[PDB]
Symmetry: D2
Subunit: 469 residues, 4 copies
C-alpha cells in the first residue's frame, strides 16, 4: 500500500463511493470475470487449434499472433466456429455479475465475448442496450437503463470479433470506427472500476494502448482496478512480485490505481460491501393499521405523512407494499415533499400493492410474491409500523415481510410505540442483535419521544442516518 499505484480496500471503497455519489461510476470488465463462471481460458481454447497447425501452445508467448497464424492456415471461419462454440455455453452469471447489476452502474465496457454481463442486468430490473457496431453508437440515446459496450465484439457475430492480430490492426478502420472516441470520452468523464484483467493476459498490450488519452498530463482523472497478489505457490515468487510491482507502477501512468487480493473470492467481498452500503439508501416500509394505537386517526395519518416527508428530505428512496392505513399516507407525505420542491414522486417511491381481482381471471400470488422479493432485495433497511386490524392482533403480512427482510439481510427497524406486529418484531428481534451500528439505530428509533411526532420522526431519521456510516 505504498508501491506506486497501490491502494487499500478502504481507499478503493472511499473513491468508488465518491463516483457513486456523483453518478460518475462505470465498469470495465474482461475475461478474468467470466472464466470462473465456466468459460475457457484462451490458452486451452487455442491448445487444440495450435496442435492443428503443428505448433505447441506451451511454446508460444503471444497467443494473439498464434490466433493469427491459425486464421491464416485454417480459414477465418475455423476461429468463428471456435468462438461460436466454446463461448456460447449455457452458463449462469456469477455472484459478482449480480452484485454489479445491483450497483448504480449505467455504463459497461468489456472485452470478453460472453453475454453474462447482460444477463445479470436482465435478471435484475435493468434492461441493457448492448452495443457492438458503430451504427448503434451514432447520434445519442437517453432511453435505456444501461449500455453494455462489447468492445471486442460478441459471440452472436464472431466473423467480426476482435481476435487475431490483424483484427486489432484493423480496429477502427474497416470496423468499429466510432468505438475509439466514445471509449476515450467515457474514460475521461467517468470513474471506472476494472475487474477481469491481469498483466499476463495475451491481449494486454493491445488493450492498454487505447488508454493513451490518459497519458495527457491534463487528465486529472482517476480509475481503480483489482488484481490477485502473487502467491507463494507461484514459482519464482520474488521475481514475479517485482515484475508485478513494476507493471502496476507502469499502469499508474494512465491514472489507474490497484488493489490486490489474494484469492478472487475477495473481489465479491468488496462488491457485496458496496451493494449493502448502497442498499441502505433504499428503505423498505411495512405495516397495516385499521387503528393507530395511542394516536388518533388524523394523528396517526399525519405521523406517517411527516415520516415519509422527512425521509424524502434527506434523500432516501422508499419501497412500500401500500398497506391498509399506511400506504395512502406514505404516498401523501412523499407527494407533499415532491409538490413542495417541484420534484417527481417516482424518483422517491416504488409501490407493491396487493390486487384483489386479477383482470385476466387467474391467481397472481406467485408473481406478486416474486415482485415483492425483487423489490426487497434492492432495499437495505426495513422499518415496521403498526400491523393491526379489527380481527388481526398481529397482522400476518407484516410478519411475513419481516421474515422476508430477515432473509435478504436487511437491517430491521421495528418501532415499539406503534404496537401490533411491529412491537412483536421488536420484542423478538432485539434479542438477536450483535452489531453496534444496528443496536444504536434500534435504540435511537424506539425512544420515548413524548408521543410528540416531530421528535418521533427525527429519532427514526437519525437511526437511518447512523446505518449509512
Amino acid at each position: 500500500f505504498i508501491i506506486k499505484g497501490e491502494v487499500s480496500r478502504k481507499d478503493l471503497i472511499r473513491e468508488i463511493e465518491k463516483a457513486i455519489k456523483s453518478d460518475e461510476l462505470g465498469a470495465f470488465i474482461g475475461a478474468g470475470l467470466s472464466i470462473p463462471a465456466g468459460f475457457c481460458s484462451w490458452k486451452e481454447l487455442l491448445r487444440e487449434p495450435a496442435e492443428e497447425i503443428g505448433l505447441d501452445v506451451e511454446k508460444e508467448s503471444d497467443l494473439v499472433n498464434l490466433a493469427q497464424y491459425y486464421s491464416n492456415s485454417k480459414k477465418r471461419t475455423s476461429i468463428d466456429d471456435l468462438i461460436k462454440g466454446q463461448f456460447s455455453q449455457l452458463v449462469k452469471p456469477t455472484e459478482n455479475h449480480k452484485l454489479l447489476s445491483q450497483l448504480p452502474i449505467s455504463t459497461f465496457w468489456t472485452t470478453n465475448y460472453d453475454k453474462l454481463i447482460e444477463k445479470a442486468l436482465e435478471n435484475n430490473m435493468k434492461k441493457p442496450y448492448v452495443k457492438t457496431k458503430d451504427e448503434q453508437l451514432r447520434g445519442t440515446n437517453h432511453n435505456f437503463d444501461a449500455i453494455v459496450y462489447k468492445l471486442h465484439g460478441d459471440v452472436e457475430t464472431p466473423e467480426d470479433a476482435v481476435i487475431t492480430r490483424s483484427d486489432y490492426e484493423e480496429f477502427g478502420y474497416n470496423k468499429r470506427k466510432l468505438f475509439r472516441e466514445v471509449l476515450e470520452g467515457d474514460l475521461l468523464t467517468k470513474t471506472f472500476l476494472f475487474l477481469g484483467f491481469s498483466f499476463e493476459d495475451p491481449n494486454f498490450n493491445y488493450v492498454i494502448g487505447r488508454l493513451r488519452v490518459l497519458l495527457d498530463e491534463k487528465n486529472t482523472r482517476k480509475h481503480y482496478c483489482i488484481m490477485k497478489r502473487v502467491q507463494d505457490a507461484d514459482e519464482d515468487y520474488e521475481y514475479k512480485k517485482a515484475r508485478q510491482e513494476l507493471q502496476i507502477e507502469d499502469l499508474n501512468r494512465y491514472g489507474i490505481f490497484t488493489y490486490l487480493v489474494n484469492k478472487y473470492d475477495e473481489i465479491t467481498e468488496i462488491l457485496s460491501t458496496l451493494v449493502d452500503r448502497f442498499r441502505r439508501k433504499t428503505i423498505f416500509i411495512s405495516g397495516s393499521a385499521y387503528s393507530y394505537s395511542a394516536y388518533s386517526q388524523k394523528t396517526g395519518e399525519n405521523f406517517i405523512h411527516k415520516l415519509s416527508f422527512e425521509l424524502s428530505k434527506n434523500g432516501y428512496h422508499i419501497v412500500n407494499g401500500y398497506g391498509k392505513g399506511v400506504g395512502e399516507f406514505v404516498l401523501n407525505g412523499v407527494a407533499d415533499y415532491c409538490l413542495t420542491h417541484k420534484s417527481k414522486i417516482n424518483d422517491f417511491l416504488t409501490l407493491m400493492p396487493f390486487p384483489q381481482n386479477s383482470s385476466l381471471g387467474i391467481d397472481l400470488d406467485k408473481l406478486y410474491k416474486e415482485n415483492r422479493e425483487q423489490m426487497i432485495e434492492s432495499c437495505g433497511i426495513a422499518i415496521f409500523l403498526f400491523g393491526n386490524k379489527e380481527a388481526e392482533d398481529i397482522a400476518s403480512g407484516v410478519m411475513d415481510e419481516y421474515e422476508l427482510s430477515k432473509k435478504h439481510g436487511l437491517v430491521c427497524l421495528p418501532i415499539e410505540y406503534t404496537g401490533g406486529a411491529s412491537k412483536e418484531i421488536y420484542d423478538q428481534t432485539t434479542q438477536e442483535i450483535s452489531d453496534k451500528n444496528t443496536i444504536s439505530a434500534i435504540e435511537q428509533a424506539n425512544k420515548q419521544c413524548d408521543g410528540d411526532i416531530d421528535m418521533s420522526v427525527k429519532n427514526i431519521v437519525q437511526a437511518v442516518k447512523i446505518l449509512n456510516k
Copy 2:
C-alpha cells in the same frame, strides 16, 4: 405538392407521427423561430456596426463576411458586446416553443444564440441538458430529459460564438471538435423537424454544408421542414417563386422535404395539431366514491381495477388525483397490469394526491392547484366516474376538475351509469358538443352495458381509441 421535395400538411403530419411512434423524433431550429419572440434579425443587428466601419448593410450580400470585416476593424470584443447585448434580452418564449416542449422531443439542435428553447422546457416538466462545448459531448449520458445542442454557441459565452466567416472556418479545429460527428449521427438516426430557417438566411450555405453525410445514396433517411411560401407582396413574385422552387429541389438531395405555409402563424397550427393528437395518448381520470351506485363495493372496486388494467393493455398513460374510493383501485389495476407483464408502473401512472397536513406547516393549495393544472394540460382525455360521498350528492372536486379540463380543451368522457357528479357532467355537457368523433366516443362509452363489467370497460376503451384517429 408535386414540386420535388414538396409535401402536404397531412403528409408531414403522417411521417412526423411515425417518428413520434418510434421515439425517433428530434427538432432542428434556427433564428426564424426566435425573431417573432422579440429578437433582432441579423440585418438590422449589423446595420449600425456596418455604418461603424464605413459600409452600408443594404449593399452587402453576405452578412457573414460583413461580421468578419467588422471583427477585424473593431476588435472581436465589439461583436461579443453586440451579441451579449442584443441577444440576452428578457424575452418570453413563443407558443411554438411551448408546443415543442410538450411534444416527445428529446434531442434539440439549434443555430441561434438565444435561450428560449431551454426555457420552454424548464417551464414544462422537462429539465434540459444544454451542451455548448465538446467537453459536454464526451462519453455518454442517459440522465437528462432532453439535450439542447447550441451548435453555433450561446449568448453566455459569446467570445466563442460562431459568427464571423473564420468562426465557420475554424469550426471543429480549434473549437467544437466533436459537434460534427454527434450531429451527423443524429441526422442519420433521428427524423428531424426543421423550423426557424429560410433559404435567404445569411449563414445558410455554411449551415447546409454540414449535411453532406445525407448525400450518400445509402442514406435512406427522411427529414421534414417548414417555410413560408412566396407572397404577392414580395416583388418579383414569379421569379422568386422559381428560385424558391429550385432551392427546395436542391434541398431534397439531402433527404429533406418541405411544407409551405403562407404566414408563420400556420406553423403553430401544425404544432398544436401534433400536441393535441399526442395528448390523447395521456388520459385524465377524475372521481370520488364512498358508495359505488348500482355496483356493490367489491364490484365497484374491480370495475375500476379492470378499467385501468385495460387502459394499460392498450398503451395509454394515466393521470389521476387519487380520489376517495377511486384511486386505490386505479393503482391496483395498473399494478396488476405491470406485475402481469413485468412492466414498471411509473411508465403508466402519474398521481396527484391531496395532502392533509403539510409537514412544513403551511398551506399548499396554491402549489397543488398549479401541479394539477400542469398535469392536466399534458392530458388529452378526461374520464369522470362516480363523484359522491355521504354528504356530497355532487362531489365538488369532480366538478372543479371538469371545469379545469374544459379550460384545457380536453375531450370530456363522463360516464352516465355511475351517477353523481359524473352523471351531472353528462347531463350538462352532452348539449355542448358538435364534433362527430367526440359524439361517437361519448355514445360508445355510456352504452347500456347490461351492468356487466367486461362490455362496460370495453365500451370506454373503444371510445378512447376512436378519439385517437
Copy 3:
C-alpha cells in the same frame, strides 16, 4: 492600409524566396480569362435561362451551378466545361514568364491547361496532379508539379463546380490535396495572381488557408489585384470594401499589391525574369589565335575566368567554341572538382557537331535551341572571335545582334581582339544605361599580363549588373 505593399518591396521579398528555392505560384481565373476564355457570368447565362434564372440577378454563381446541375443532370455540366473551357488557347506572356522563373510548385483552381502547356512550351517537364493516387508517397524526378485543386477539363465529371462539389471536397475525392496544400502553404512562399474578392467561389477558396491563421505561422505570401476605378459606381464605397478585404487577407499572412491595369502583372513578372536571368550568363567567342596572349595564357585566362564565375554562383551557357569555349569546360570542371560539385549544376553547353548523327540537317534545330538558351541568359559576354583567316569570326557578330534581340546586357572585352573587339566598338556607342555603362567600364579596365586583374574586372562587372 494593412497588407498593402510597394512594388519594390514585393520584388525584394519575392526574390528572397527565390534565393532559397522557397517560391511557389498560386493561379486562378484572372490569368486565363484574358487569354480568351469566357467569364462565368456569361458562361452560365444560357444555362441560367435554361432553368428560369437570370445570371444578372443571381449573385451566388456556385449555388446557381448547383441548381442547374440538379434540374439538368451532372452530365450536362460535364458537357458544359468540356465545351467552352476546352478551347485550345495559347498561354499568355505571363505564362511564359512564369515558365522562365524558378517556380517548381504550381497550385491552380483553373480547369484549363494553359500553365501546364506554357511549361511544356519550354525545357520543363510538368507533372499535372489532379487525383489522390498521384500525390501518394514521394517523387523527386519531375521538373515541376501543377496541382489542379478544382479538377481538370479532361475529367469534368470530377471537376469542382457546383456547391456540393465543394461540400464533398476531401471526403469522397481529393482526400490528400488538403494536407499537401497546407504543407506547401506553410513551407513555401506563394505568389497569388488570378484572383479577386469579387470572384464567385472566393468564400469557398479562402477556407483552405485556415491553417495560416495559426498564430504560430511565420510565413508570408503575396498577391496582385486590380485597384478600384473612378468610373466604377460607388467608387469610394468599393474602395472601402476592397480596403477592408485586403486587411482581411493579411490574417492568413497574405499581402497585396494593387495594379491599375492588368498589364502591370506582366511588368512585374517581366522585371523579375530580367533580374533573375542575370544570375546565368552566356559566353560567346572562338580563338584560333590567342590575341594579346601567348597560347597558354589565352587558354588559362578563359579557364580561370570560368572558374571564378562558378565560385561567385553564376551559371554559364557556352557553345563549346574552339579556343574560347574549349577551356571554359576545363575551368568549371576544376571548380566542381575543387568544391565537390556536379558540372551540369554550373555549366550548360551548346556544341555544334561535325557530322549529323545518322544523316539529318540540324541547323534550324540548333538555332532554335540557341535562341531559347539565350532567352534563359541575362548577360552576354563576348571574347576573341577569330578563325584561320577571319579577323571577325562569323558566328560572334550575329550573336551580338542575337543578344541585342533578347535584351541581354552585352559585356564584350576589348583586349581580346577579333569580332569581340568589333562588338565592343559597336556596343560602347549604342548604350544609354548608367548601370550597364558602369559595369562595362569595370570590365574593360586592365593591368594586362596580370590575368587576376582581368578576371576581377569581369567578375565585379557582373556583380555590378546584379545589384
Copy 4:
C-alpha cells in the same frame, strides 16, 4: 510455402522495380548490428538488473524498456541511446552497395546514421527526415531522403523506444510519417533487409503496413531473412513457426528470400549492383592520329558511336580525351538535340585541365574522382591510345588495369590501334567467361570503312553483356 521466392526471381522482380524507378529500401537492425552495435538483449542487461529484472527472463523488451524508463526517468534512456548507439562506426559493404544502387527512398527504424553516411560517402546528398516539419509540403531537389521512423540518436528524447513511445506515435509527434509511409508503400516496391520475426518490436512494426491488407493492393514487396539452422533447438518446430510467419507476411504483399548466412545479403546486393552498373559505360582513349581511318572518319566514328550508345539508353562516362573523348560530346549532343533531352542525363565527363584554377595540385583528387567514377561503370570500352610520338598512350594502359581492379567488363577495340590494341591483345588471353568472350567477339568483328557495321558490332556487344 507461400511467400517464399527464388534468388533469381527476387533479382528479376527487383530489377523490374529498378527499370521504373519504383524501388525503395526498408532497413532495420539486422544491417547495423553486424557493423559493431550491441543487440538489444545485451544493451538492456545492465538496466534490467538496475530495476531487478533479467533480460534472459523477459521476452518483451519493449515493455521492459518502459518499466526501466518508469523507475529511472526518461533522461536515463536518453543517455542510454546517446551512449551505446552513438558509436561512430563505418557503414558495411551492404551500405555502400545500396549507395551505388538507384534507391531514392529509404525508410529505417534504426537509431544510428550508418545508411545516411554511407550515402554521404558517395556523390549522394542525403536528406534525413525525422520530424513532421520536414515532411510538410513538397521538395524535389535533394538526391534522396532517409526516413527515420523511430527517431535518431541526435534527439533520443524523441526516439521511439518504450511501449508508450509507440502508443503516442502519430498523435503528439510524427503525425505525418504514417500517411507518407503508407503512400511510399502503396506506390514504390520496397526491399526489406534488417528484420526478423524474432525482433522485439516486430508486433509494433508490422501494424504500420495494415494498408497493404486492402484487397485493392496490387503492390508486391520483398524481404530477406535468416533460415533456421539444425543446431538451433526445436529445429523442426522453429522451421514450422517461421514457415507460418512467412505465409503471414504475404498478406501485406511481402515475399521472402531465405539465406543461410548473412553474407548472402551482400552476394545479392553485389549481384544487383554489377548487373545495374552495365547500364552505364566508361570509355577510354585518346587519338592524336586517327589510325586506320581518315581524320574525319575517325572523328565521326566516335561521334556516331556515342550517339547510338545514347539511343540504346546507356550512360557514358568519358575523360574528355583529345581525339577520342572530344567527339563523344558532339555525338551525344546530337542525340540529345535530336530527342529533346538534356546532355547530363546521358553524358558524364572527367576532364583534366591544363592550369590549376588558382594554384593547387589536383592529381590525387582527380584520380580519386576517377576511381569512384569507374566504380559506377560496369563496362569499360577502350579506343585508340596514341599521342604525338607515343604508340601506347600512357593513361589508357593504366586505365585497363584500373577497370580490371574494379571488375569492369573490358571491351577493347582492335581495329583502332594504339594502347587500345595492346589492351585487346592482353585481355583476349586473360578471360574465361562465355558471355564476356561472346560479346568481345561480337564487338571486334568488322566490315571496315563501313562504320555502321562497327557501331552495330559494339552496341550489340553491349546488349549481349546486359542479358
